[PDB]
Design a protein around this ligand. Sequence first.
Ligand SMILES: Nc1nc2c(ncn2[C@@H]2O[C@H](COP(=O)(O)OP(=O)(O)OP(=O)(O)O)[C@@H](O)[C@H]2O)c(=O)[nH]1
Ligand SMILES: CN(C)Cc1[nH]c2ccccc2c1[C@H]1NC(=O)c2ccc(O)cc21
Ligand SMILES: [Mg+2]
Length: 170
Amino acid sequence: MTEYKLVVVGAGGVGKSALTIQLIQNHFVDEYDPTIEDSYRKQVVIDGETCLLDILDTAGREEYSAMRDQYMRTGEGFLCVFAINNSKSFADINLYREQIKRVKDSDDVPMVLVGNKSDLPTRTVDTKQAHELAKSYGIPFIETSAKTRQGVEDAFYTLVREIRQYRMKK
Ligand SMILES: Nc1nc2c(ncn2[C@@H]2O[C@H](COP(=O)(O)OP(=O)(O)OP(=O)(O)O)[C@@H](O)[C@H]2O)c(=O)[nH]1
Ligand SMILES: CN(C)Cc1[nH]c2ccccc2c1[C@H]1NC(=O)c2ccc(O)cc21
Ligand SMILES: [Mg+2]
């Protein structure tokens, strides 16, 4: 089977861990426990191809902005997560993408934009800004909720599809 190293990146508290744990355990983590760095290996079937996903759940805390370089070189796909109710986390996406492009020295890195916490009545970033940002990067935009499980599989599986296309393309 084919391996895919996926990196989940974004500001602290956007729901990187809640999304990964929802994908892997079908459980919603309601408590906020700031991640240092966790990794999970999961076997899933995607479009009839058996995939071995090696998911890296990274630290959103800015004091861990030094571990980034190593995992950005090794990562094959990046799940760039922001929370739709946190404008700063949306602005932080540009910074994560610029860093990934510098480290990879490339314009096209397999990447998916994720708007998490879609279950909340208090969005500060409207869907139009999000769609336009992803459009400007040339990447899929997925709306998710780690609480309801909305778009969780779509987010990770779209990223795998982006990597697969990139490999077939290169
Ligand atoms: N309503 C709602 N709450 C969410 C969602 N995703 C995460 N949360 C909550 O937001 C808080 C932070 O979620 P985390 O997954 O721990 O955030 P994180 O990005 O992994 O944080 P760091 O590891 O510090 O970067 C927790 O209280 C979660 O329950 C979601 O889609 N909806
Ligand atoms: C191999 N898995 C058990 C863990 C794992 N999953 C990943 C998914 C994407 C990118 C990297 C990784 C790693 C690590 N492998 C590395 O080379 C590396 C460098 C720095 C790190 O912070 C972490 C890793
Ligand atoms: Mg976390």
